[PDB]
Structure 1
Amino acid sequence: WLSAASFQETTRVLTDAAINCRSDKLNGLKENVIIGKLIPAGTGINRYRNIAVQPTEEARAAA
């Protein structure tokens, strides 16, 4: 409902969501933008966000 709220007819969608007790997943792109969380696109997905980087063992030996 957050995306619909920030798009058009804010009052109507707010009223209908409140009546239905519409719990938002907070998983969409626009919602993540509003909250400030990382968007689920580009470098925001879990595969890229949780990349572990450490030097190669041969490179460690070079120091």
Structure 2
Amino acid sequence: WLSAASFQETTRVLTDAAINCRSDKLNGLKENVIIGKLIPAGTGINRYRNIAVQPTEEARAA
């Protein structure tokens, strides 16, 4: 509903969201943009955003 409120017809969307007591799961790049969270695309998906990086032992010796 947060995504739809920012596109068009904010009043109608907000009214119908209040009546239906909607709950936004906050998953979607536009919503993350609004709330300031890493968008779930590109470098923001959990595959790349959580990476373990450590030097090798052959390089730690050299």
Deviations 1:23-50 (A, max 9, x none): 0000011000000000000000001011
Query: RMSD of the alignment, in Å?
Result: 0.8
Q: Percent same amino acid among aligned pairs?
A: 100
Aligned positions, number: 62
| d(CA) in 2 for partners of 1:3, 1:57 | 48
TM superposition score normalised by structure 2: 0.96
Q: State the secondary structure of the residue aligned to 1:40.
A: coil
Which 5+ residue runs of structure 2 have no aligned equivalent?
none
How much has 1:12 moved relative to structure 2? Answer: 0.3
| d(CA) in 1 for partners of 2:44, 2:4 | 23
Which 5+ residue runs of structure 1 have no aligned equivalent?
none
Q: State the secondary structure of the residue aligned to 2:53.
A: strand
How much has 1:3 moved relative to structure 2? Answer: 0.8
After superposing on structure 2, the runs of 4+ consecutive aligned residues of structure 1 that deviate more than 2 Å are none
